[PDB]
Design a protein around this ligand. Structure first.
Ligand SMILES: COCC(=O)N[C@@H](Cc1ccc(-c2cc(Cl)cc(Cl)c2)cc1)[C@H](O)[C@@H](O)C(=O)O
Length: 164
């Protein structure tokens, strides 16, 4: 039996018993231990509030000696998230056999809340964000886009029977 199996079943249980705030973790519908659904809710008092965003963790067979891959399925406009959904996360500071899903999920919240415009993944989002912060949020173009995606997700919430 793969060492990964037991490490993932334990990590799944830990996260369903003590969730990271805003995240809800399950397997995909076919029950593949190695492919997790991640449901992410925008927190109150942010432009993401009321959001329902979906992402995926794909784990290798040798986890935790190699890192999972993380990808948004929801389209997202952010200096650090690619067109594809892939994400800008160093720890994927670098990966260790002692890092774990809980740390990955917190480093997503950290990428979310504080964009790095130094090495952007989405260069137009990145320059549009610097301009937004420059204006001390007086300029509405970046938050217009986020607001639209957030409202869009209410369709996904409804298709999935969630629960915002
Ligand atoms: C442009 O929109 C930017 C935005 O709303 N930023 C927020 C940071 C922030 C906080 C939380 C998240 C966040 C957290 C989780 Cl757990 C899920 C999601 Cl979808 C977003 C992202 C950014 C705020 O500026 C921040 O100061 C606050 O109100 O806490």
């Amino acid at each position: 039996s793969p060492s990964s199996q037991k490490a993932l079943l334990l990590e799944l249980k830990g996260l369903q018993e003590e969730p990271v705030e805003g995240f809800r973790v399950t397997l995909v519908d076919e029950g593949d231990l190695y492919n997790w659904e991640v449901a992410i809710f925008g927190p109150p008092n942010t432009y993401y509030e009321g959001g329902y965003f979906k992402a995926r963790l794909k784990f290798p067979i040798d986890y935790p000696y190699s890192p999972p891959a993380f990808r948004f399925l929801t389209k997202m406009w952010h200096p650090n998230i690619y067109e594809t959904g892939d994400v800008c996360i160093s720890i994927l500071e670098r990966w260790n056999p002692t890092q774990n899903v809980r740390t990955i999920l917190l480093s997503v919240i950290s990428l979310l809340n504080e964009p790095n415009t130094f090495s952007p993944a989405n260069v137009d989002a990145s320059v549009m964000y610097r301009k937004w912060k420059e204006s001390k949020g007086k300029d509405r173009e970046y938050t217009d886009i986020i607001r639209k995606q957030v409202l869009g997700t209410k369709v996904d919430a409804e298709r999935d029977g969630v629960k915002v």
